[PDB]
């Protein structure tokens, strides 16, 4: 989905376009001309709000560049099958009806007046004869991402915007499950995204394997579909294509053959189904946090794979030519146990943060050699061994198997960049489970962070022993005004349990409009509620009272959708019934493992002498001006001085404090910040005599030198 939406993007900023600062608020708003040309719901929530959009589902681009949109004309108060594409200019002159407006089977407008969209964002009833154009489907104004949010007609614009922008952040799991309730756009978005491989022509599959599948065409010509396994995407997540068809099975042209990431049977599936219970539980789900059963962790329900790529290259230096080799100066054989003969870790070796991946030695031959040092070399006969060791190592926080390694060598004419000879990149894969700090979210913008992961026995369970797999606080449902998720939960349960509408006495009044083939569904059935035209409130109320009984012969949820839960710890039933159902929960990519930093001491800058480090030490956290005001407000003068002088800039201070802490000595007094001295020595260079006067109006010589020890 993220790939598909990126292609459909409509950027507004960039060369030849308005910049952020020049973009007045008047251009970021919505206009009545966006209806059918550019989705109003989907757009980045950050500063780039309104400058980035997306084509609607039906939008088309005319040769000049103006975005067209289909409409079907009305010859005389009667709808017509043939459609005509109209741009904004041609829309204003004509009159556009609405899709939801009822129409007789013969095309006659049942009502005398129908809601209409007039020239300039004006809507008002008009006689049924004056209408000149009618929409095609109610889903015309929504983008691809927004078109797969069930019950979008019940959410607010803010939530739907977050819901749309989070389906593009989901992460593919190990095993994908199609949503129980989802709009019809699921299938088409997956087919057109290009992830799945679709048979070009009809045929019978002669042989299928985990690597390739060959289809025997009707013309006698063979074709082999090589499908990639465990291939790193751009952002790190893995990509797999597991065939779904079986040997000897006929396949028709255009059918899906294998399911890429986030796909099940060819329909987009970005997450799992979890038995939600909506109630505040012991504060562990306080203010948008989430509580998860331990079943998800132990059964790999929300387990995900992530691939990291590390690469190092050997380049010819002035002193000599760098070479990747298994021999490194003064390192034990255990640290080099996993390195292969070539000097690069062998496939399948489990590495951790710090181990050596590529054995690289660089030449230091033409470097100064201390008289005592080369004397030592002669004393033992020890090899000069000037070569240094800039050996690739796993950056802090990375682990996992080594799935594969590729080596590009100029000796075999692999077309490497000028100046390098050997270039090896090592792929290390880690299987991340779900833990505290990970972000989950439904399709309705209901974000959250995993507050706690309780054991299975602690989770409240239905009367039949089934423990709810997730709990959502109920204080955030009404305030945010995304009641749609409650509706999704109800319809989710009805889809999971399976219903049998009472038909002996005829269709009940509320079920008159239900399609005749929707009156009976088996358990684990899959249902669809297209955006802006789907299950009504009357229909859900009817289905909830007609769900099939459990295998034990008892109906769990009552007519209102609430069920009697048993407390997992106390063991006594909760005084009042609680909501329960299956909600489709994704797994966002703001994982905790990425967001964790710590720095006791690390590499420092060169011009500013401030902390910074490339994953060798995570690097310091900025202490802005606003934090400085907070410290001043408290009257905390000593703490503020430490945060700015001793541990950020005062070079002699940093060394002394680290020697004092390691020992038992008290931390010494801070010195003069390096930032000030730099400012003074750079203000003097503009020919501005700057002096730090003291009492008696005498300058203090800021330059000072004292030799420790």
């Amino acid at each position: 989905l993220s790939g598909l939406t990126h292609k459909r993007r409509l950027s507004a900023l960039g060369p030849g376009g308005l910049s952020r600062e020049r973009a007045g608020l008047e251009v970021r708003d919505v206009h009545p001309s966006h209806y059918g040309r550019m989705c109003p719901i989907e757009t980045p929530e950050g500063p780039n709000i309104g400058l980035i959009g997306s084509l609607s589902v039906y939008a088309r681009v005319n040769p000049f560049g103006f975005i067209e949109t289909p409409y079907r004309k009305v010859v005389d108060g009667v709808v017509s099958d043939e459609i005509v594409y109209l741009t904004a200019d041609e829309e204003d002159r004509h009159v556009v009806a609405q899709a939801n407006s009822p129409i007789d089977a013969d095309g006659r407008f049942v009502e005398p007046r129908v809601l209409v969209r007039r020239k300039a964002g004006e809507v008002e009833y008009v006689p049924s004869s004056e209408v000149d154009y009618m929409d095609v489907s109610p889903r015309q104004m929504v983008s691809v991402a927004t078109a797969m949010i069930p019950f979008l007609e019940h959410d607010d614009a803010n939530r739907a915007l977050m819901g749309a922008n989070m389906q593009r952040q989901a992460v593919p799991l190990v095993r994908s499950e199609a949503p129980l309730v989802g709009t019809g756009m699921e299938l088409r978005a997956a087919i057109d995204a290009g992830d799945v491989v679709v048979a070009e022509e009809s045929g019978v599959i002669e042989e299928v394997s985990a690597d390739y599948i060959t289809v025997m065409h009707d013309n006698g010509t063979r074709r082999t579909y090589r499908m990639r396994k465990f291939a790193r995407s751009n952002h790190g997540t893995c990509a797999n294509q597991c065939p779904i068809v079986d040997a000897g099975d006929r396949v028709e042209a255009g059918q899906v053959i294998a399911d890429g990431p986030c796909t099940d049977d060819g329909e987009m599936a970005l997450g799992k189904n979890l038995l939600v219970a909506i109630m505040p539980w012991e504060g562990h789900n306080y203010e948008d946090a989430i509580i998860l059963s331990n079943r998800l962790v132990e059964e790999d329900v929300l387990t995900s794979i992530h691939i990291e790529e590390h690469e190092i290259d050997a380049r010819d230096t002035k002193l000599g030519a760098e070479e990747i080799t298994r021999d490194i100066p003064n390192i034990s054989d255990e640290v080099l146990a996993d390195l292969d003969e070539r000097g690069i870790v062998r496939i399948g070796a489990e590495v951790r943060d710090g181990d050596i991946l590529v054995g690289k030695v660089t030449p230091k031959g033409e470097t100064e050699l201390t008289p005592e040092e080369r004397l030592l070399r002669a004393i033992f006969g020890e090899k000069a061994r000037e070569v240094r060791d800039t050996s690739l190592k796993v950056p802090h926080g990375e682990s996992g198997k080594v799935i594969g390694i590729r080596v590009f060598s100029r000796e075999d004419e692999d077309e490497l960049p000028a100046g390098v000879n050997e270039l090896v990149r090592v792929y290390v894969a880690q299987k991340r489970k779900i833990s505290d700090g990970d972000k989950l979210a439904g399709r309705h913008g209901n974000k959250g962070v995993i507050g706690k992961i309780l054991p299975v026995e602690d989770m409240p369970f239905l009367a039949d022993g089934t423990p709810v797999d997730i709990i959502l606080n109920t204080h955030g449902v009404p305030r945010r005004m995304n009641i749609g998720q409650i509706l999704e939960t109800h319809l989710g349960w009805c889809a999971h349990s399976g219903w049998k509408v009472d038909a002996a006495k005829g269709v009940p009044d509320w079920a008159a409009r239900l399609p005749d083939e929707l009156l009976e569904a088996q358990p684990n059935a899959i249902v669809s509620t297209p955006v802006f035209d789907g299950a009504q409130e009357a229909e859900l109320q009817g289905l909830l009272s007609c769900t099939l009984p459990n295998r034990d012969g008892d109906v769990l949820v009552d007519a209102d959708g609430k069920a009697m839960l048993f407390d997992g710890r106390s063991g006594e039933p909760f005084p009042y019934p609680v909501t329960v159902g299956y909600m489709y929960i994704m797994k966002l990519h703001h994982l905790v493992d990425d967001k964790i930093h710590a720095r006791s001491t690390g590499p420092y800058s060169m011009i500013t002498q401030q902390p910074l480090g490339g994953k060798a030490q995570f690097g310091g956290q900025r202490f802005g001006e606003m934090e400085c005001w907070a410290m001043q407000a408290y009257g905390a003068a000593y703490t503020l001085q430490e945060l700015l002088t001793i541990k950020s800039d005062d070079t002699v201070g940093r060394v002394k404090v680290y020697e004092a802490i390691v020992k038992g000595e008290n931390i010494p007094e801070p010195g003069i910040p390096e930032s000030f001295k730099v400012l003074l020595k750079e203000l003097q260079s503009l020919c501005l005599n700057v002096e730090v006067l003291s009492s008696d109006g005498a300058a203090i010589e800021l330059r000072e030198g004292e030799d420790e020890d």
Binding site: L4, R8, V57, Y58, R60, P70, R72, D81, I83, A99, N100, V136, S137, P138, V144, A178, G182, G184, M185, L187, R188, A189, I191, D192, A193, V251, E252, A253, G254, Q255, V256, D265, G266, E267, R513, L514, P515, E517, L518, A521, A525, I526, V527, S528, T529, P530, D533, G534, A535, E539
Partner: peptide, 25 residues
């Protein structure tokens, strides 16, 4: 009416017939 042959038949609540199929996205 599933355009793609091998589609999972998911019954839908749609009540209005769509006269135009989704274009190549």
């Amino acid at each position: 009416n599933n355009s793609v042959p091998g589609a999972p038949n998911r019954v839908s609540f749609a009540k209005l017939r769509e006269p135009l199929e989704v274009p190549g996205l």
